[PDB]
Amino acid sequence: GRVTNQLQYLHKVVMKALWKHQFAWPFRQPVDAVKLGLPDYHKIIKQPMDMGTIKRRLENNYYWAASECMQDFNTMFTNCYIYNKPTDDIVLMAQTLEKIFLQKVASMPQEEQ
Amino acid sequence: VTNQLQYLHKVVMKALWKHQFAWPFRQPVDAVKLGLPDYHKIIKQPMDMGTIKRRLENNYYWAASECMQDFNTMFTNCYIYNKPTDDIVLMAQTLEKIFLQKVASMPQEEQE
Ligand SMILES: CN1Cc2ccccc2NC1=O
Numbered sequence: 237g238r239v240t241n242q243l244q245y246l247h248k249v250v251m252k253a254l255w256k257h258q259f260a261w262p263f264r265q266p267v268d269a270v271k272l273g274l275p276d277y278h279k280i281i282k283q284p285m286d287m288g289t290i291k292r293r294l295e296n297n298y299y300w301a302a303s304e305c306m307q308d309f310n311t312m313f314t315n316c317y318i319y320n321k322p323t324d325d326i327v328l329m330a331q332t333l334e335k336i337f338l339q340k341v342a343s344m345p346q347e348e349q
Numbered sequence: 350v351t352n353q354l355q356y357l358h359k360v361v362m363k364a365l366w367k368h369q370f371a372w373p374f375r376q377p378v379d380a381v382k383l384g385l386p387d388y389h390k391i392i393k394q395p396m397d398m399g400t401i402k403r404r405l406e407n408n409y410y411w412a413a414s415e416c417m418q419d420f421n422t423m424f425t426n427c428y429i430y431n432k433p434t435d436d437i438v439l440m441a442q443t444l445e446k447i448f449l450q451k452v453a454s455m456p457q458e459e460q461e
């Protein structure tokens with residue numbers, strides 16, 4: 237991977253805002269299905285993703301383009317909607333964070349460097 | 350009309366609307382037709398491409414972010430309601446990946 241203007245923005249603007257959010261705590265590290273008591277989590281969710289993993293990938297220049305990082309954010313949110321019950325608080329928390337994600341992505345620099 | 354909304358109309362909606370997996374999303378979920386009796390008890394804000402496309406055509410959106418939230422709601426509704434192993438979920442995921450890919454190259458500053 238490499239350092240682009242967009243990936244810097246995703247790291248220093250988007251992720252930083254999401255990371256600090258009061259609903260972000262369940263998403264800052266990989267889902268621990270045993271510790272959280274989530275039955276069949278890894279049988280249902282085949283590509284776990286979380287903001288800690290994404291943050292580390294940004295720090296280690298893992299991504300080649302902004303879209304790749306955005307796809308990882310999407311996977312994290314989608315996993316949450318797929319696995320959990322519609323009425324679970326975690327779904328509402330993911331929706332709230334995801335709206336901020338899209339809002340911030342809307343103002344990301346247009347051409348990648 | 351803004352530069353970003355034009356991009357969402359001409360690039361994003363254009364690509365998604367004609368996609369081979371788009372057909373279940375081109376009109377509002379008809380719970381009776383599709384045999385999904387609990388649909389509206391679970392999904393409180395239905396959304397679909399036809400509605401978004403109509404909104405784009407009629408200059409309903411004030412900002413690109415608003416249109417992006419409608420796309421997001423459409424996909425999120427699908428993941429929440431349907432079973433994880435349903436084909437519709439795979440179709441939604443495929444379309445959303447294209448949505449995100451294209452949104453990555455959307456104009457940065459919203460100018461009226
Ligand atoms: C991301 N999480 C973490 C979590 C923590 C507590 C209860 C449920 C969940 N499910 C998820 O999908």
Ligand SMILES: CN1Cc2ccccc2NC1=O
Nearest residue numbers: 373374378383427430431437
């Ligand atoms: C958006 N759709 C449309 C659909 C078509 C056929 C079977 C299930 C669904 N569920 C959805 O969430």
